[PDB]
């Protein structure tokens, strides 16, 4: 079909760590003030490569992530907030609080991937949007005409 | 200290996925009725685990030093897939992280003798099989011994 590749030329595997490193204006993190639900945001300083992401297709298969097929995204690291590190869309931006739902549509928790300077994210089932940097306390993710292009590079290889 | 080896004689890493398989039957999963939150349960080999020392150091899981345990997998419940002793007396799913001093029922520990075990540290005791629909996890004197084996290696 059309798998999503990493910066080395290799496919994306489910449960494996990748950085959402940006070819645009770095990676993504979990950031919110004071309290709790962390919101998905962009990494601040310059050593901040970001936090590693794990992508999980909805159906068990050959565990390869493909372009356009729906999935779940999560930061598989423990956080200071009790909410799930899996991505939710509020309808606002992306939060961390996501259940999983293998029924019919209406579930602002399923994302997807599609190409352009690499791949992109689509909060879609029948197609809703394509997130971009919010921009202003934290570089949150929303949806725009100028959209956040990122390349997925693997944490230890 | 002494590192927790996995079943192949190799150390436990952090982030690396491990199945906490029993020794006499099944691994650990997340389980509850049709209502949230989820509790750690026993049974398949279960669900994979992930261990995170509270210090970013050698990146080895070692005997005694505290750590967080998480299921790095998406769940049907909004709560964190990181462990949290409930103290009201099972293992739940509101895993926060705390660098403050003691009184934090989320950090755990490893203890040898099977091979390794678990402990709620910040210790109180060692978790057992709870048997409280599905078999949860409580701390007791009839401990639950598990062994850590790796998922694609």
UniProtKB/Swiss-Prot annotation, chain B:
Molecular function per GO: serine-type endopeptidase inhibitor activity
Pfam families linked: Kunitz_legume (PF00197)
Top-level taxonomy: Eukaryota, Viridiplantae, Streptophyta, Embryophyta, Tracheophyta
CDD domains assigned: beta-trefoil_STI_AMTIN
Disulfide bonds: 36-77, 119-129
UniProt name for this protein: Trypsin/chymotrypsin inhibitor
SMART domains to which the protein is assigned, alphabetical: STI (SM00452)
Assigned protein family: Belongs to the protease inhibitor I3 (leguminous Kunitz-type inhibitor) family.
SUPFAM superfamilies xrefs: STI-like
